[PDB]
mmCIF file of C-alpha atoms in Angstrom:
data_model
loop_
_atom_site.group_PDB
_atom_site.id
_atom_site.type_symbol
_atom_site.label_atom_id
_atom_site.label_comp_id
_atom_site.label_asym_id
_atom_site.label_seq_id
_atom_site.Cartn_x
_atom_site.Cartn_y
_atom_site.Cartn_z
ATOM 1 C CA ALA M 511 -27.998 -24.602 11.790
ATOM 2 C CA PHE M 512 -25.784 -22.603 9.322
ATOM 3 C CA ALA M 513 -26.073 -18.826 9.815
ATOM 4 C CA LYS M 514 -28.666 -16.590 11.432
ATOM 5 C CA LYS M 515 -32.120 -15.646 10.136
ATOM 6 C CA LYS M 516 -31.779 -12.024 8.951
ATOM 7 C CA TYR M 517 -34.385 -9.239 9.152
ATOM 8 C CA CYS M 518 -35.054 -6.699 6.599
ATOM 9 C CA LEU M 519 -33.674 -3.209 7.208
ATOM 10 C CA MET O 450 -20.085 8.269 -1.930
ATOM 11 C CA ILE O 451 -17.077 6.986 0.140
ATOM 12 C CA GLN O 452 -14.513 5.044 -1.997
ATOM 13 C CA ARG O 453 -11.269 3.417 -0.705
ATOM 14 C CA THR O 454 -8.374 2.555 -3.089
ATOM 15 C CA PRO O 455 -6.860 -0.956 -2.827
ATOM 16 C CA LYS O 456 -3.611 -1.730 -1.014
ATOM 17 C CA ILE O 457 -1.610 -4.272 -3.093
ATOM 18 C CA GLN O 458 1.039 -6.798 -2.017
ATOM 19 C CA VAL O 459 2.714 -9.309 -4.382
ATOM 20 C CA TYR O 460 4.631 -12.174 -2.737
ATOM 21 C CA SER O 461 5.205 -15.955 -2.658
ATOM 22 C CA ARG O 462 3.533 -18.521 -0.361
ATOM 23 C CA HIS O 463 6.953 -20.094 0.467
ATOM 24 C CA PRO O 464 10.431 -18.467 0.476
ATOM 25 C CA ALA O 465 11.466 -18.032 -3.217
ATOM 26 C CA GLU O 466 13.958 -20.657 -4.559
ATOM 27 C CA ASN O 467 14.834 -20.551 -8.314
ATOM 28 C CA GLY O 468 13.537 -23.752 -10.028
ATOM 29 C CA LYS O 469 11.290 -24.797 -7.055
ATOM 30 C CA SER O 470 7.453 -24.811 -7.515
ATOM 31 C CA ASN O 471 5.708 -22.166 -5.335
ATOM 32 C CA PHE O 472 2.555 -19.994 -5.320
ATOM 33 C CA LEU O 473 2.489 -16.359 -6.468
ATOM 34 C CA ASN O 474 0.048 -14.249 -4.420
ATOM 35 C CA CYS O 475 -1.502 -10.857 -5.056
ATOM 36 C CA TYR O 476 -3.324 -9.629 -1.940
ATOM 37 C CA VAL O 477 -5.671 -6.664 -2.499
ATOM 38 C CA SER O 478 -7.166 -5.114 0.645
ATOM 39 C CA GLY O 479 -8.616 -1.941 2.159
ATOM 40 C CA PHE O 480 -10.857 -1.200 -0.879
ATOM 41 C CA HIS O 481 -14.489 -0.094 -1.326
ATOM 42 C CA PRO O 482 -16.638 -0.775 -3.260
ATOM 43 C CA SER O 483 -15.962 -4.509 -3.913
ATOM 44 C CA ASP O 484 -15.715 -4.588 -7.763
ATOM 45 C CA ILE O 485 -12.007 -5.064 -8.616
ATOM 46 C CA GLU O 486 -10.043 -6.581 -11.521
ATOM 47 C CA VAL O 487 -6.768 -8.393 -10.676
ATOM 48 C CA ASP O 488 -4.376 -10.055 -13.159
ATOM 49 C CA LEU O 489 -1.131 -11.894 -12.355
ATOM 50 C CA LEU O 490 1.523 -11.219 -15.052
ATOM 51 C CA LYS O 491 4.492 -13.366 -16.199
ATOM 52 C CA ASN O 492 6.932 -11.258 -18.325
ATOM 53 C CA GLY O 493 4.070 -8.710 -18.802
ATOM 54 C CA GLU O 494 1.402 -11.256 -20.052
ATOM 55 C CA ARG O 495 -1.710 -12.375 -18.179
ATOM 56 C CA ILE O 496 -1.444 -15.789 -16.417
ATOM 57 C CA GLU O 497 -4.556 -17.942 -17.150
ATOM 58 C CA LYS O 498 -6.812 -19.791 -14.624
ATOM 59 C CA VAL O 499 -5.665 -17.615 -11.630
ATOM 60 C CA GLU O 500 -7.790 -18.527 -8.543
ATOM 61 C CA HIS O 501 -9.089 -16.136 -5.861
ATOM 62 C CA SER O 502 -10.473 -16.276 -2.329
ATOM 63 C CA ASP O 503 -14.158 -15.686 -1.477
ATOM 64 C CA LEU O 504 -15.029 -11.979 -1.019
ATOM 65 C CA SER O 505 -14.758 -10.914 2.623
ATOM 66 C CA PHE O 506 -13.937 -7.737 4.531
ATOM 67 C CA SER O 507 -12.174 -6.398 7.610
ATOM 68 C CA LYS O 508 -13.975 -5.015 10.693
ATOM 69 C CA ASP O 509 -13.600 -1.465 9.126
ATOM 70 C CA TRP O 510 -15.813 -2.849 6.240
ATOM 71 C CA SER O 511 -12.965 -2.648 3.647
ATOM 72 C CA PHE O 512 -12.859 -5.630 1.245
ATOM 73 C CA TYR O 513 -9.958 -8.031 0.658
ATOM 74 C CA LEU O 514 -9.179 -10.779 -1.889
ATOM 75 C CA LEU O 515 -6.207 -13.086 -2.451
ATOM 76 C CA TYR O 516 -5.401 -13.972 -6.101
ATOM 77 C CA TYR O 517 -2.964 -16.872 -6.512
ATOM 78 C CA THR O 518 -1.383 -19.244 -9.031
ATOM 79 C CA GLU O 519 1.292 -21.977 -9.036
ATOM 80 C CA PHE O 520 4.654 -20.692 -10.372
ATOM 81 C CA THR O 521 8.325 -21.766 -10.521
ATOM 82 C CA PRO O 522 10.490 -18.638 -9.967
ATOM 83 C CA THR O 523 13.661 -18.292 -12.123
ATOM 84 C CA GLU O 524 16.473 -15.646 -12.204
ATOM 85 C CA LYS O 525 15.134 -14.153 -15.508
ATOM 86 C CA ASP O 526 11.272 -14.411 -15.290
ATOM 87 C CA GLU O 527 9.497 -11.184 -14.114
ATOM 88 C CA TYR O 528 6.194 -11.483 -12.164
ATOM 89 C CA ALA O 529 3.697 -8.733 -11.317
ATOM 90 C CA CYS O 530 0.123 -8.005 -10.249
ATOM 91 C CA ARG O 531 -2.115 -5.617 -12.251
ATOM 92 C CA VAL O 532 -5.086 -4.086 -10.388
ATOM 93 C CA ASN O 533 -7.960 -1.902 -11.601
ATOM 94 C CA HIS O 534 -10.603 -0.306 -9.349
ATOM 95 C CA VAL O 535 -13.082 2.609 -9.711
ATOM 96 C CA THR O 536 -10.608 4.697 -7.547
ATOM 97 C CA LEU O 537 -7.728 4.167 -10.103
ATOM 98 C CA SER O 538 -7.543 6.302 -13.329
ATOM 99 C CA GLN O 539 -5.329 3.516 -14.875
ATOM 100 C CA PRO O 540 -4.427 -0.090 -13.895
ATOM 101 C CA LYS O 541 -1.746 -0.180 -11.119
ATOM 102 C CA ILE O 542 1.141 -2.676 -11.694
ATOM 103 C CA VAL O 543 3.108 -3.918 -8.626
ATOM 104 C CA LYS O 544 6.244 -5.985 -9.429
ATOM 105 C CA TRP O 545 7.100 -9.150 -7.462
ATOM 106 C CA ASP O 546 10.196 -8.337 -5.319
ATOM 107 C CA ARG O 547 11.299 -11.536 -3.461
ATOM 108 C CA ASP O 548 12.548 -9.352 -0.500
ATOM 109 C CA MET O 549 9.143 -7.694 0.249
ATOM 110 C CA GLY I 1374 -7.132 -19.116 24.062
ATOM 111 C CA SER I 1375 -10.154 -17.004 22.976
ATOM 112 C CA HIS I 1376 -12.140 -17.756 19.756
ATOM 113 C CA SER I 1377 -14.691 -16.057 17.477
ATOM 114 C CA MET I 1378 -17.309 -17.224 15.001
ATOM 115 C CA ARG I 1379 -18.215 -14.500 12.493
ATOM 116 C CA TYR I 1380 -20.268 -14.258 9.307
ATOM 117 C CA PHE I 1381 -19.328 -11.566 6.758
ATOM 118 C CA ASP I 1382 -22.216 -10.902 4.343
ATOM 119 C CA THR I 1383 -22.053 -8.642 1.256
ATOM 120 C CA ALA I 1384 -25.119 -7.740 -0.866
ATOM 121 C CA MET I 1385 -24.443 -5.561 -3.917
ATOM 122 C CA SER I 1386 -27.006 -4.139 -6.328
ATOM 123 C CA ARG I 1387 -26.143 -4.008 -10.048
ATOM 124 C CA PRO I 1388 -28.985 -2.303 -11.952
ATOM 125 C CA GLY I 1389 -29.415 -3.767 -15.455
ATOM 126 C CA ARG I 1390 -27.250 -6.836 -14.538
ATOM 127 C CA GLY I 1391 -29.859 -8.867 -12.597
ATOM 128 C CA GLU I 1392 -30.765 -9.037 -8.900
ATOM 129 C CA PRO I 1393 -28.236 -8.062 -6.207
ATOM 130 C CA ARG I 1394 -25.447 -10.585 -5.563
ATOM 131 C CA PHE I 1395 -25.463 -11.986 -1.984
ATOM 132 C CA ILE I 1396 -22.355 -13.690 -0.565
ATOM 133 C CA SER I 1397 -22.063 -14.951 3.034
ATOM 134 C CA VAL I 1398 -18.745 -16.306 4.396
ATOM 135 C CA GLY I 1399 -18.426 -17.890 7.871
ATOM 136 C CA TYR I 1400 -15.162 -17.949 9.844
ATOM 137 C CA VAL I 1401 -13.869 -19.468 13.060
ATOM 138 C CA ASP I 1402 -11.023 -17.045 13.904
ATOM 139 C CA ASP I 1403 -8.998 -16.779 10.619
ATOM 140 C CA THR I 1404 -10.354 -20.073 9.116
ATOM 141 C CA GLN I 1405 -13.242 -19.918 6.610
ATOM 142 C CA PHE I 1406 -15.678 -22.847 7.154
ATOM 143 C CA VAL I 1407 -18.680 -21.995 4.891
ATOM 144 C CA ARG I 1408 -19.559 -19.879 1.871
ATOM 145 C CA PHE I 1409 -22.835 -19.174 0.099
ATOM 146 C CA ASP I 1410 -22.807 -17.123 -3.139
ATOM 147 C CA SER I 1411 -26.138 -16.411 -4.916
ATOM 148 C CA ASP I 1412 -24.050 -16.252 -8.174
ATOM 149 C CA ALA I 1413 -22.499 -19.781 -7.645
ATOM 150 C CA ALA I 1414 -22.689 -21.762 -10.957
ATOM 151 C CA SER I 1415 -22.755 -24.952 -8.771
ATOM 152 C CA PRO I 1416 -24.547 -24.239 -5.434
ATOM 153 C CA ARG I 1417 -23.902 -27.944 -4.426
ATOM 154 C CA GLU I 1418 -20.025 -27.781 -4.592
ATOM 155 C CA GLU I 1419 -19.667 -24.554 -2.471
ATOM 156 C CA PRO I 1420 -16.641 -24.939 -0.145
ATOM 157 C CA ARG I 1421 -16.675 -26.269 3.482
ATOM 158 C CA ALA I 1422 -13.823 -26.655 6.061
ATOM 159 C CA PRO I 1423 -12.736 -30.348 6.294
ATOM 160 C CA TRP I 1424 -13.912 -30.555 9.992
ATOM 161 C CA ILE I 1425 -17.578 -29.801 8.935
ATOM 162 C CA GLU I 1426 -19.881 -32.916 9.015
ATOM 163 C CA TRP I 1427 -27.505 -29.046 5.248
ATOM 164 C CA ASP I 1428 -30.821 -28.331 3.370
ATOM 165 C CA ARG I 1429 -32.291 -26.247 6.302
ATOM 166 C CA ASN I 1430 -28.938 -24.321 6.448
ATOM 167 C CA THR I 1431 -28.708 -23.695 2.643
ATOM 168 C CA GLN I 1432 -32.382 -22.634 3.067
ATOM 169 C CA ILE I 1433 -31.383 -19.905 5.631
ATOM 170 C CA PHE I 1434 -28.777 -18.508 3.139
ATOM 171 C CA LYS I 1435 -31.386 -18.516 0.320
ATOM 172 C CA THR I 1436 -33.897 -16.674 2.576
ATOM 173 C CA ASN I 1437 -31.083 -14.256 3.638
ATOM 174 C CA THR I 1438 -30.434 -13.490 -0.078
ATOM 175 C CA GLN I 1439 -34.084 -12.374 -0.427
ATOM 176 C CA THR I 1440 -33.941 -10.441 2.896
ATOM 177 C CA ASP I 1441 -30.758 -8.515 1.848
ATOM 178 C CA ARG I 1442 -32.439 -7.679 -1.511
ATOM 179 C CA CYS I 1443 -35.470 -6.334 0.479
ATOM 180 C CA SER I 1444 -32.984 -4.335 2.632
ATOM 181 C CA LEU I 1445 -31.233 -2.811 -0.422
ATOM 182 C CA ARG I 1446 -34.617 -1.696 -1.896
ATOM 183 C CA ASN I 1447 -35.599 -0.091 1.460
ATOM 184 C CA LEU I 1448 -32.174 1.609 1.888
ATOM 185 C CA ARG I 1449 -32.346 3.161 -1.613
ATOM 186 C CA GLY I 1450 -35.664 4.751 -0.516
ATOM 187 C CA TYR I 1451 -34.353 5.835 2.922
ATOM 188 C CA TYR I 1452 -31.577 7.870 1.172
ATOM 189 C CA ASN I 1453 -33.785 9.138 -1.743
ATOM 190 C CA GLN I 1454 -31.388 7.353 -4.160
ATOM 191 C CA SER I 1455 -32.002 6.779 -7.881
ATOM 192 C CA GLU I 1456 -32.590 3.276 -9.354
ATOM 193 C CA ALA I 1457 -29.441 3.808 -11.539
ATOM 194 C CA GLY I 1458 -26.667 3.393 -8.911
ATOM 195 C CA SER I 1459 -25.001 0.295 -7.444
ATOM 196 C CA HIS I 1460 -25.087 0.085 -3.609
ATOM 197 C CA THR I 1461 -23.553 -2.249 -1.021
ATOM 198 C CA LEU I 1462 -25.015 -3.655 2.220
ATOM 199 C CA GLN I 1463 -22.535 -5.440 4.512
ATOM 200 C CA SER I 1464 -23.292 -7.300 7.736
ATOM 201 C CA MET I 1465 -21.114 -8.897 10.409
ATOM 202 C CA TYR I 1466 -22.568 -11.113 13.149
ATOM 203 C CA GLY I 1467 -21.417 -13.792 15.551
ATOM 204 C CA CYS I 1468 -19.963 -14.526 18.979
ATOM 205 C CA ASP I 1469 -16.658 -14.331 20.890
ATOM 206 C CA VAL I 1470 -15.918 -16.984 23.590
ATOM 207 C CA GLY I 1471 -13.125 -17.266 26.180
ATOM 208 C CA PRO I 1472 -10.827 -20.289 26.794
ATOM 209 C CA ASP I 1473 -13.668 -21.919 28.882
ATOM 210 C CA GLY I 1474 -16.087 -21.539 25.887
ATOM 211 C CA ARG I 1475 -18.123 -18.913 27.868
ATOM 212 C CA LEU I 1476 -19.709 -16.040 25.861
ATOM 213 C CA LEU I 1477 -17.526 -12.884 25.951
ATOM 214 C CA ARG I 1478 -19.877 -10.896 23.665
ATOM 215 C CA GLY I 1479 -22.132 -10.996 20.627
ATOM 216 C CA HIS I 1480 -22.126 -8.905 17.426
ATOM 217 C CA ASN I 1481 -24.721 -7.984 14.803
ATOM 218 C CA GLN I 1482 -24.027 -4.860 12.745
ATOM 219 C CA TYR I 1483 -24.482 -3.378 9.265
ATOM 220 C CA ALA I 1484 -22.855 -0.879 6.908
ATOM 221 C CA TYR I 1485 -24.366 0.747 3.806
ATOM 222 C CA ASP I 1486 -22.016 1.979 1.048
ATOM 223 C CA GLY I 1487 -19.079 1.478 3.470
ATOM 224 C CA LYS I 1488 -20.606 3.608 6.320
ATOM 225 C CA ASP I 1489 -21.741 2.156 9.685
ATOM 226 C CA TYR I 1490 -25.563 2.020 9.595
ATOM 227 C CA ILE I 1491 -26.946 0.124 12.637
ATOM 228 C CA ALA I 1492 -25.466 -2.140 15.328
ATOM 229 C CA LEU I 1493 -26.843 -4.315 18.100
ATOM 230 C CA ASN I 1494 -25.379 -2.945 21.350
ATOM 231 C CA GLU I 1495 -23.239 -5.180 23.611
ATOM 232 C CA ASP I 1496 -26.361 -5.651 25.856
ATOM 233 C CA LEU I 1497 -27.953 -7.618 22.912
ATOM 234 C CA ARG I 1498 -31.193 -5.671 23.656
ATOM 235 C CA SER I 1499 -30.804 -2.166 22.104
ATOM 236 C CA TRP I 1500 -29.670 -0.618 18.802
ATOM 237 C CA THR I 1501 -27.331 2.220 17.812
ATOM 238 C CA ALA I 1502 -28.516 3.937 14.585
ATOM 239 C CA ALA I 1503 -25.990 6.130 12.679
ATOM 240 C CA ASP I 1504 -28.535 8.521 11.045
ATOM 241 C CA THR I 1505 -32.261 9.242 10.449
ATOM 242 C CA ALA I 1506 -32.412 6.400 7.839
ATOM 243 C CA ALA I 1507 -31.080 3.815 10.342
ATOM 244 C CA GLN I 1508 -33.592 5.224 12.921
ATOM 245 C CA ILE I 1509 -36.365 3.879 10.585
ATOM 246 C CA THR I 1510 -34.720 0.415 10.721
ATOM 247 C CA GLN I 1511 -34.319 0.763 14.514
ATOM 248 C CA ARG I 1512 -38.043 1.610 15.006
ATOM 249 C CA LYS I 1513 -39.063 -1.328 12.744
ATOM 250 C CA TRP I 1514 -36.755 -3.769 14.609
ATOM 251 C CA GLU I 1515 -37.966 -2.458 18.021
ATOM 252 C CA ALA I 1516 -41.629 -2.951 16.905
ATOM 253 C CA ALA I 1517 -40.855 -6.555 15.754
ATOM 254 C CA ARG I 1518 -38.656 -7.394 18.862
ATOM 255 C CA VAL I 1519 -35.807 -8.407 16.445
ATOM 256 C CA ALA I 1520 -33.107 -7.894 19.155
ATOM 257 C CA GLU I 1521 -34.688 -10.737 21.220
ATOM 258 C CA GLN I 1522 -34.288 -13.119 18.206
ATOM 259 C CA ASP I 1523 -30.672 -11.998 17.579
ATOM 260 C CA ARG I 1524 -29.847 -12.359 21.318
ATOM 261 C CA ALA I 1525 -31.270 -15.933 21.338
ATOM 262 C CA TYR I 1526 -29.092 -16.823 18.288
ATOM 263 C CA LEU I 1527 -25.900 -15.155 19.622
ATOM 264 C CA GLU I 1528 -26.117 -16.604 23.188
ATOM 265 C CA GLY I 1529 -27.461 -20.039 22.133
ATOM 266 C CA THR I 1530 -26.933 -21.373 18.584
ATOM 267 C CA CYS I 1531 -23.743 -19.328 17.846
ATOM 268 C CA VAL I 1532 -21.886 -20.291 21.093
ATOM 269 C CA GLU I 1533 -23.069 -23.963 20.819
ATOM 270 C CA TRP I 1534 -21.840 -24.305 17.193
ATOM 271 C CA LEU I 1535 -18.515 -22.514 17.899
ATOM 272 C CA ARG I 1536 -17.877 -24.950 20.829
ATOM 273 C CA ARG I 1537 -18.718 -27.962 18.549
ATOM 274 C CA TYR I 1538 -16.470 -26.638 15.700
ATOM 275 C CA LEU I 1539 -13.511 -26.005 18.068
ATOM 276 C CA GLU I 1540 -13.809 -29.612 19.411
ATOM 277 C CA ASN I 1541 -14.215 -31.203 15.912
ATOM 278 C CA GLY I 1542 -11.379 -29.015 14.466
ATOM 279 C CA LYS I 1543 -9.168 -28.984 17.625
ATOM 280 C CA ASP I 1544 -6.004 -30.184 15.741
ATOM 281 C CA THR I 1545 -6.098 -26.967 13.563
ATOM 282 C CA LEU I 1546 -8.495 -24.389 15.110
ATOM 283 C CA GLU I 1547 -6.894 -24.739 18.608
ATOM 284 C CA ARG I 1548 -3.314 -24.989 17.255
ATOM 285 C CA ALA I 1549 -1.280 -21.746 17.169
ATOM 286 C CA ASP I 1550 1.613 -21.956 14.669
ATOM 287 C CA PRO I 1551 4.442 -19.600 15.685
ATOM 288 C CA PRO I 1552 6.122 -17.268 13.187
ATOM 289 C CA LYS I 1553 9.387 -18.295 11.492
ATOM 290 C CA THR I 1554 11.510 -15.111 11.838
ATOM 291 C CA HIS I 1555 14.637 -13.578 10.251
ATOM 292 C CA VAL I 1556 16.156 -10.080 9.759
ATOM 293 C CA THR I 1557 17.415 -8.934 6.323
ATOM 294 C CA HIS I 1558 19.805 -6.025 5.639
ATOM 295 C CA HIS I 1559 19.719 -3.948 2.382
ATOM 296 C CA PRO I 1560 22.061 -0.926 1.930
ATOM 297 C CA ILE I 1561 20.078 1.979 0.296
ATOM 298 C CA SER I 1562 23.166 4.313 0.083
ATOM 299 C CA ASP I 1563 26.697 4.690 1.566
ATOM 300 C CA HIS I 1564 24.919 6.352 4.572
ATOM 301 C CA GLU I 1565 21.849 4.157 5.325
ATOM 302 C CA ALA I 1566 20.484 0.574 5.195
ATOM 303 C CA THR I 1567 17.052 -1.066 5.563
ATOM 304 C CA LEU I 1568 16.605 -3.655 8.334
ATOM 305 C CA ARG I 1569 13.522 -5.799 7.638
ATOM 306 C CA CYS I 1570 12.091 -8.119 10.288
ATOM 307 C CA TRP I 1571 10.111 -11.066 8.816
ATOM 308 C CA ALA I 1572 7.385 -13.233 10.374
ATOM 309 C CA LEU I 1573 6.227 -16.174 8.182
ATOM 310 C CA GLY I 1574 4.005 -19.238 8.581
ATOM 311 C CA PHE I 1575 2.010 -18.085 11.668
ATOM 312 C CA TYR I 1576 -1.611 -18.777 12.683
ATOM 313 C CA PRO I 1577 -3.751 -17.054 13.837
ATOM 314 C CA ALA I 1578 -3.159 -13.722 12.016
ATOM 315 C CA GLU I 1579 -2.886 -11.630 15.247
ATOM 316 C CA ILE I 1580 0.822 -10.703 15.755
ATOM 317 C CA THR I 1581 2.891 -7.877 17.150
ATOM 318 C CA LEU I 1582 6.016 -6.973 15.209
ATOM 319 C CA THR I 1583 8.085 -3.862 16.109
ATOM 320 C CA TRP I 1584 11.611 -2.240 15.786
ATOM 321 C CA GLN I 1585 13.256 -0.614 18.918
ATOM 322 C CA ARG I 1586 16.353 1.684 18.794
ATOM 323 C CA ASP I 1587 18.315 1.510 22.122
ATOM 324 C CA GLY I 1588 15.131 -0.084 23.626
ATOM 325 C CA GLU I 1589 12.799 2.801 22.483
ATOM 326 C CA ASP I 1590 9.860 2.073 20.081
ATOM 327 C CA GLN I 1591 10.357 3.397 16.478
ATOM 328 C CA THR I 1592 6.545 3.614 15.818
ATOM 329 C CA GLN I 1593 6.871 6.653 13.461
ATOM 330 C CA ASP I 1594 10.053 5.403 11.625
ATOM 331 C CA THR I 1595 8.823 1.761 11.115
ATOM 332 C CA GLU I 1596 7.220 0.673 7.790
ATOM 333 C CA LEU I 1597 4.698 -2.055 8.794
ATOM 334 C CA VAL I 1598 2.902 -3.965 5.946
ATOM 335 C CA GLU I 1599 -0.608 -5.333 6.523
ATOM 336 C CA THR I 1600 -0.650 -8.966 7.688
ATOM 337 C CA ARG I 1601 -1.215 -11.058 4.539
ATOM 338 C CA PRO I 1602 -2.404 -14.618 3.876
ATOM 339 C CA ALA I 1603 0.096 -17.169 2.479
ATOM 340 C CA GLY I 1604 -2.737 -19.431 1.102
ATOM 341 C CA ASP I 1605 -1.772 -22.491 3.291
ATOM 342 C CA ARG I 1606 -3.886 -21.113 6.260
ATOM 343 C CA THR I 1607 -0.860 -19.154 7.605
ATOM 344 C CA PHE I 1608 -0.030 -15.442 7.544
ATOM 345 C CA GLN I 1609 3.010 -13.244 6.871
ATOM 346 C CA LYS I 1610 4.149 -9.792 7.998
ATOM 347 C CA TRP I 1611 7.268 -7.636 7.975
ATOM 348 C CA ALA I 1612 8.443 -4.420 9.630
ATOM 349 C CA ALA I 1613 11.308 -2.279 8.247
ATOM 350 C CA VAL I 1614 13.448 0.577 9.624
ATOM 351 C CA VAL I 1615 16.074 2.701 7.825
ATOM 352 C CA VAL I 1616 19.223 2.837 10.004
ATOM 353 C CA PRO I 1617 22.525 4.719 9.746
ATOM 354 C CA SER I 1618 25.387 2.525 8.399
ATOM 355 C CA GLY I 1619 27.296 0.946 11.344
ATOM 356 C CA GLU I 1620 24.428 1.440 13.907
ATOM 357 C CA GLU I 1621 22.589 -1.861 13.079
ATOM 358 C CA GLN I 1622 23.279 -3.479 16.527
ATOM 359 C CA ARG I 1623 21.281 -0.672 18.285
ATOM 360 C CA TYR I 1624 18.091 -2.013 16.588
ATOM 361 C CA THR I 1625 16.199 -4.901 17.754
ATOM 362 C CA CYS I 1626 13.018 -6.764 16.434
ATOM 363 C CA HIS I 1627 10.302 -7.736 18.939
ATOM 364 C CA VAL I 1628 7.893 -10.510 17.983
ATOM 365 C CA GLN I 1629 4.763 -11.465 20.011
ATOM 366 C CA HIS I 1630 2.513 -14.371 18.898
ATOM 367 C CA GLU I 1631 0.249 -16.956 20.634
ATOM 368 C CA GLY I 1632 2.298 -19.859 19.071
ATOM 369 C CA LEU I 1633 5.604 -18.668 20.695
ATOM 370 C CA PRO I 1634 6.543 -20.112 24.127
ATOM 371 C CA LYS I 1635 8.315 -16.719 24.775
ATOM 372 C CA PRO I 1636 8.375 -13.367 22.875
ATOM 373 C CA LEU I 1637 11.345 -13.096 20.421
ATOM 374 C CA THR I 1638 14.123 -10.425 20.329
ATOM 375 C CA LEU I 1639 15.869 -10.468 16.843
ATOM 376 C CA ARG I 1640 18.950 -8.482 15.580
ATOM 377 C CA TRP I 1641 20.585 -8.379 12.153
ATOM 378 C CA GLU I 1642 22.778 -11.595 12.072
#
């Protein structure tokens, strides 16, 4: 896929 | 907060040859935060439809942008880059010198 | 040689001027291959490298926009900051591989208002928090086993895509273009002259460019400009030394670059 799933800081 | 003032370089894509089409570049780097205003000047007047790169940054987190436009250098025509940033009290003008 | 895939994400709040802007740019080495900008007037015409062949992928960038906005709201609270100020969250993540395409290491780190905030350690299992605010993020990410998700991405998806991109883009991404070099001479007075050593047209950006005097490095007396993009994928750099008139042949220029078959040694003329 494009890019990584991010997580909230 | 931490602020970093832009470094500015003004230069051509290809070696300058009077009467030969080229690209005029203004590279702004090392700055924080990211808001910045960059004009390319021909004989002191703003060039229209100047393009820029997509905002990115170095591994030290400082931002960089390339502003660029087609130009045909001549003996007489003066080119420059004008930069404003929160760190600058007044716009900084850097003249195009074909040997830097 | 070695290669990297890296995303550079910037989220910037702008109170009174709408929701925070999110921009994500992906690179292989010094070549941009993708951009997503939440401000894009035309989200369908956003640029791609020519060697790229997706809804689910656009979807990840759209979700990441919302996640970075969540992060900026939380960070404002962690630092007791007013609603009035603009703030910046930056992230860098991706993988480095060797010539065999094997993982060298992974990266996933963040900065807030230009200061390092939190980073995934090289083990891809533990976090380094810069301050008591980032310790809140660390505890949350430990509770949610976030590092395990990031490790799976960095060792799996990231390495797999970088390998595919390098193969599909081998004629450019795996081609090192050597610098075109020359030395210029500019008198500054009767007593002194500038020697400037030029490197033009090289890719990737990594280069070493030095002056020596009688074979000794002139680190302190060399003016070295930042490597700068030409706009045709290539980079430029110069290094200058001020030399006494008549002593020019004691100075040499030393050029190291992946595209050179052998390092260069350049003198004036």
